[PDB]
Design a protein around this ligand. Structure first.
Ligand SMILES: OC[C@H]1O[C@@H](O)[C@H](O)[C@@H](O)[C@H]1O
Ligand SMILES: OC[C@H]1O[C@@H](O)[C@H](O)[C@@H](O)[C@H]1O
Ligand SMILES: OC[C@H]1O[C@@H](O)[C@H](O)[C@@H](O)[C@H]1O
Lengths: 518, 518, 518
């Protein structure tokens, strides 16, 4: 419309209907010029680091993008609690996005003091990649998200992508993308932008833990009608061999026949938070579970979902097998365990094998009168018919969704870091403020113009997501575990602002509190 | 209605339509009072046995439940034969249940002689758990089923369940259930009960065996157009290396290219019924294939479906890899092989690996001029794209269905003991005769009344199941294997009553007789 | 609309209809940035002062709010006089609020000389808390109100709130509020804001004084038919005891029977404005009437409404029992009595006990032949059936309304400082100018942006209140006390501007001039 009118309003409310929640968040953003208006080839050679596992080839762009893909973007800690205490499941349904109240500003510097003024005629240009024609960066869990606390003003992250490489070099199959080669909407002060999105059908996340374990499904009062082999020798001596069979029953539960077995396993190395119990050596990379692709070793960071420890073993965690979040103000490199938050998958110990344990034992030979029976430990176990498992839990700090890679086949394409896998996830919103040249020469030159006016833009983003809820039907008599605040005398309220104005999130909050039968 | 009228009739017929069978069974039951009208916390501590694998925590209830979940409940041996000889497949469709002609009886004992009288005003109360809000006990294969022989009167089994535990202790996530906290129908003599159930869509059980093996699918008369590496050395000597390639053809079938491979394997230890061929040692538990869950080892009793032995090896069976049924009158503990019936999965040797064999071999290294080629045995193999398998066979003595555990994911949720997996299986029917207090004090006391009239109830159950049939279309010229009775001079007719009045089932009858092409 | 159009007009008129008055006020405001765009935890620890009575915990916000909650906002001194001379009562009815002609301005400073320019694209955001979901700050009588004189330009006060504390620490029950978590309307130059409000039904304020006292309601000419005990002894001597009864009549009025008694009392310490008559000691805090809450002592500042002094005792006032207003230009701390204005409740001496007196006397024992009759002084008296009282008077300088605390119970929830109590008072209007970032880095950083453009906003506020009037019906023959200006030779007109341009209010003006029968 015009310079004097606001093109949108601040909308942060969240409304709770019966089966649905609608969260709306508004933030203030700032967009710098990136790469001096250039596309740039980037590689580990451009970075200077040399390792085959770390080699890459790609491009950085002048563009930037919006990321609302963490839950704390859409939920207050109080709202998150209302979700996880009262519901068996939730999934996203619809999405609404807005850009409004856009301000482009010119920066003028002369002797070292800078002046900021409005440039009213400058434009910022925006588009969504709806056909998923760009490398999709939102699936990897990166920073640059809308801040969890509504009063914080955030910088928009720079867009870049990777393609095929051999070492630092490219190959003919490597592809280059100019984002100017897409249609984008141009917006001056007084123009606004919006689009809507429908989440494709996904299963509900399971916000519950099981109140039963897969190995105790039976009636403790009744015998099975099935027999197992109890004795193979009549006693001590020579040539003592029998086949004795017993009924499986309450007295021996481990031996009963069962219809279903725990899910797959890929074993992790066990690390103690008590430090004297760890080996004295550097095992971090060497002792790590990894997978190889085209000669590169990728550490298996969030591998298959597994129980992080056995009972009472809480000090133990898998080496890379769990999500690790930083506390507010935590540095980038070589930080103590105190400054990081290690989440645990403990609730899924009912259907899932422990991450640091073998799956089980198998027979490795044929016994005979000559040969004793030999077993071996199953370190990794793929899917078997009759396996049953839970996915990884969801966190208020964690990612909401991921893009399922477009491929001939996949199995159970739930994101291993967590959340909802989608062939067509919420599209990428790419934003850039358009280059404004400085004064060109007065005689013609064919070289592209490398001299521009220093600018940046600010504005507001609204994101609205509808969430479908799955209510708890339970007949459980005794009360249940809920997420609570503790009452006792803190210096600071948790999930509140600091005395210096800093918002922090004291601990990770998982989704799984309510219980179901297994 | 009233004391003098029958509230139902005896209905045992089974009617065979073209595509469907309807089996109806009627039995007479007796219901005791369980637990002295109490709910009781039970654990391995209450049982006194201590092993971490066998530890449990749960509750026993005053309630009891009906189990018709074995096939011999619904099929006579003659009906079972008509099913398995004439049909390629079957599945359950509808279910109808009735309770009628209910009689509550008071037991009076004074000096040690007891008198039984009718209590006409007493009531028995019944409900089905339709929302699956209770721990589901019918999936584990327990005793307490309707007896296979219609003239036998059976005792109703006591209901109980398990929940989470650490050792014998519970955890806050453990859940307690009062069955009085459900609505239930009360029934006096003259009241009857019924409900209907729809089986959710399940695949047909495969009542056939394959007439082809997965490794012979080819035309024996024709060569492939594909080549394999036949020779790696030109001959004996030094520096003799070649690559020689041959056509795969009828002469060498093992090396041909194939589109599909056999199903997954988890290896079992091999045990001989000839006893002198077994090792002299106790390998039963130690040499057993197991899986671990939260620190407990559960023996893998009916693991993935696998051929129980190779050809001519019938004396061999997997250590726990097969269902083991007892003969009539067989004791509970340490019984000889003669008194038990070991079933075999032999028919599936066409698509499935043998339970006691390795899946195959893989390369463990890179060969080179320095290093010879090394292989290793694959003891367990998870699912691979292109695998093809058969499920475990169904038995007249075996379970019909199971409840699929409610979870984020599962694969091929066919019950490993056998039958039809269902998210919503036939619901549990829970029955209890209501407590009738003895004479209370004449001055008020707040304690709950612990003194009751000794009672029990009897009545009849009808169960009606419709089964959908899949007829055989085969073009096979030669006659086929059928299930038969042998003609020769027994002292007793098989599947008949004893001279003392005892009904026995002489052998397990599987489903797989007719054949199909693979 | 646009940059060149005014979005509202100046409206200050007040129109007098028969039963209603409509006051409209327009002011010019200025809004700074508060807290550097931060929320900040604040406590007596952050302030450094330590006393348990003064301990607090809370938050300061970047937001600010409008306060029109004093009468001089809505009434000129002439209008106030027209109200209080002609009417028995008044109450508020409707409310209309407007924000318009909004101007955001950028402040640029380099070498220490600052330049102010218009920022045309900046926005200010406004919302009302209509659901009363925020801590309500307008009830406490704070500064920051619209100035009484229309030509003064006022600064908008900063919003902040308190929550639960133990000492300077918080508790788990303490709650934090982000105001960005509400929907708010954004407004650029050319946008305006308005909303309407309905006062919920409140009683009229009593703008009258009683022309009778509660202890003289009788006919002075007539006797009562009731008797009192006049004599207990026949005379001087031993064993002189009688019961003598007399008629209560005009000669002895104190002893007559009465249907109604004066209202409740909580006694205050008496302080003289003649200073030599006060004790020589510091009794201010020590000799003060207080109430205790959770271990803290809160001085009872405007306690129950009571007559401030007896007749002719005008020099006396309760220690904290009355509202104390400052004269124009009066300092914050340790100011002489000359610079402050002490109001008096004198008019209510008819129905209300004096603040500095005991309520009365009660019997403390049983008299007998052995024991003389003993009485004791009633220092505080709660409500009794048959009590009758007046509320505190209203002042042109005083507060209009208060929010009744949301609670299970309350009694006579009239605000003790004065005015109209409401469960849903006029809502809080919260205003903030939105942060405009300075130029962000050209490489992405995840830290929130702490660098902003210095801004402030100005504009106009209109407030329109309809007041319902209660006209005087009186039959009084003699003329009545009115509020007047004195005619005699001042250097300055009262309620006028200074010679230096300063507006002052010379004295407090109460509401109670006209009289009624009691
Ligand atoms: O040699 C490959 C390297 O890979 C890196 O990811 C790791 O941090 C190094 O310690 C080393 O393992
Ligand atoms: O040590 C665990 C035990 O588990 C039982 O199920 C088994 O019968 C024992 O022989 C032993 O293996
Ligand atoms: O000891 C509590 C204190 O409370 C304050 O409000 C007062 O000004 C002090 O003089 C003292 O009474």
């Amino acid at each position: 419309d015009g310079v004097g009118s606001s093109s949108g309003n601040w909308h942060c409310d969240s409304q709770w209907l019966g089966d649905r929640v609608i969260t709306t968040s508004t933030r203030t953003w700032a967009l710098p010029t990136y790469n001096n208006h250039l596309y740039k080839q980037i590689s580990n050679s451009t970075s200077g680091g040399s390792s085959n596992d770390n080699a890459y080839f790609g491009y950085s762009t002048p563009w930037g993008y919006f990321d609302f893909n963490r839950f704390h973007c859409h939920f207050s800690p109080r709202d998150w609690q209302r979700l996880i205490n009262n519901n068996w499941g939730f999934r996203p349904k619809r999405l609404n996005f807005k850009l409004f109240n856009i301000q482009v500003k010119e920066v003028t510097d002369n002797n070292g003091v800078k002046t900021i003024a409005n440039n009213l005629t400058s434009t910022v240009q925006v588009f969504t990649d709806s056909d998923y024609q760009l490398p999709y960066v939102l699936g990897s869990a990166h920073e640059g998200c809308l801040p969890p606390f509504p009063a914080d003003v955030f910088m928009i992250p720079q867009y870049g992508y990777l393609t095929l490489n051999d070492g630092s070099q490219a190959v003919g199959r490597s592809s280059f993308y100019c984002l100017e080669y897409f249609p984008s909407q141009m917006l001056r002060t007084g123009n606004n932008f919006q689009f809507s999105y429908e989440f494709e059908n996904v299963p509900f996340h399971s916000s519950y833990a099981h109140s039963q374990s897969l190995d105790r499904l039976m009636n403790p009062l009744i015998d099975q009608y099935l027999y197992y082999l109890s004795k193979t020798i009549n006693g001590s001596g020579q040539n003592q061999q029998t086949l004795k069979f017993s009924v499986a029953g309450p007295s021996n539960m481990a031996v009963q026949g069962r219809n279903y077995i725990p899910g797959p396993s890929y074993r992790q190395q066990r690390v103690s938070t008590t430090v004297t119990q760890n080996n004295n050596s550097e095992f971090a990379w060497p002792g790590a579970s990894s997978w190889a692709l085209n000669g590169r070793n990728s550490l298996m960071n969030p591998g298959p979902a597994m129980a992080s420890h056995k009972e009472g073993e809480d000090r133990f965690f898998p080496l890379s097998g769990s999500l690790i979040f930083g506390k507010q103000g935590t540095g980038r490199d070589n930080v103590d365990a105190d400054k990081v938050m290690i989440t645990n998958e403990e609730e899924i110990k009912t259907t899932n094998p422990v991450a640091t344990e073998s799956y089980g034992q198998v027979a490795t030979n044929h016994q005979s009168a000559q040969a004793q029976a030999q077993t071996g430990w199953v370190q990794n176990q793929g899917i078997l018919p009759g396996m049953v498992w839970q996915d990884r839990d969801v966190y208020l700090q964690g990612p909401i969704w991921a893009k399922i890679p477009h491929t001939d086949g996949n199995f159970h394409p739930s994101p291993l870091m967590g959340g909802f896998g989608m062939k067509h996830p919420p599209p990428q919103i790419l934003i850039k403020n358009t280059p404004v040249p400085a004064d060109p020469p007065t005689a013609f030159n064919k070289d592209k113009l490398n001299s521009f006016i220093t600018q940046y833009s600010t504005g507001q983003v609204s994101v609205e997501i509808e969430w479908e809820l799955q209510k708890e039907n339970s007949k459980r008599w005794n009360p249940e575990i809920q997420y609570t605040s503790n009452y006792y005398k803190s210096n600071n309220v948790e999930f509140a602002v600091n005395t210096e104005g800093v918002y922090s999130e004291p601990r990770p909050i998982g989704t799984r509190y309510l219980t179901r039968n297994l």
